[PDB]
UniProtKB/Swiss-Prot annotation:
Post-translational modification: Hyperphosphorylated in hippocampus, neocortex, and spinal cord from individuals affected with ALS and FTLDU. Phosphorylated upon cellular stress.
Biased segments, Low complexity type: 32-48
Subunit details: Homodimer. Homooligomer (via its N-terminal domain). Interacts with BRDT. Binds specifically to pyrimidine-rich motifs of TAR DNA and to single stranded TG repeated sequences. Binds to RNA, specifically to UG repeated sequences with a minimum of six contiguous repeats. Interacts with ATXN2; the interaction is RNA-dependent. Interacts with MATR3. Interacts with UBQLN2. Interacts with HNRNPA2B1. Interacts with ZNF106. Interacts with CNOT7/CAF1. Interacts with CRY2.
Annotated compartments: Nucleus; Cytoplasm; Cytoplasm, Stress granule; Mitochondrion
Membrane-traversing stretches: none
Organism: Homo sapiens
Related illness: Amyotrophic lateral sclerosis 10: A neurodegenerative disorder affecting upper motor neurons in the brain and lower motor neurons in the brain stem and spinal cord, resulting in fatal paralysis. Sensory abnormalities are absent. The pathologic hallmarks of the disease include pallor of the corticospinal tract due to loss of motor neurons, presence of ubiquitin-positive inclusions within surviving motor neurons, and deposition of pathologic aggregates. The etiology of amyotrophic lateral sclerosis is likely to be multifactorial, involving both genetic and environmental factors.
Region Disordered, annotated ranges: 31-50
Tissue specificity remark: Ubiquitously expressed. In particular, expression is high in pancreas, placenta, lung, genital tract and spleen.
Name the record gives this protein: TAR DNA-binding protein 43
Part of the full-length chain shown: 311 to 360 of 414
Domains as described in the record: Consists of an N-terminal domain (NTD) and two tandem RNA recognition motifs, RRM1 and RRM2, followed by a C-terminal glycine-rich region.
Reported function: RNA-binding protein that is involved in various steps of RNA biogenesis and processing. Preferentially binds, via its two RNA recognition motifs RRM1 and RRM2, to GU-repeats on RNA molecules predominantly localized within long introns and in the 3'UTR of mRNAs. In turn, regulates the splicing of many non-coding and protein-coding RNAs including proteins involved in neuronal survival, as well as mRNAs that encode proteins relevant for neurodegenerative diseases. Plays a role in maintaining mitochondrial homeostasis by regulating the processing of mitochondrial transcripts.
């Protein structure tokens, strides 16, 4: 009797795919973990006087 008639239009699956847009792709000032190109941070203690 189900000649493809009881096929349900996706919504939860549809929203899940859209939720990815909020999952990642965040703004830089919101994600405090910023990357640096090279050892410019200087974590060495030798040469560090405070």
């Amino acid at each position: 009797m189900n000649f493809g008639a009881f096929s349900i239009n996706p919504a939860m699956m549809a929203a899940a795919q859209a939720a990815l847009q909020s999952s990642w792709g965040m703004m830089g000032m919101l994600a405090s973990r910023q990357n640096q190109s090279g050892p410019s941070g200087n974590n060495q203690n030798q040469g560090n006087m405070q």
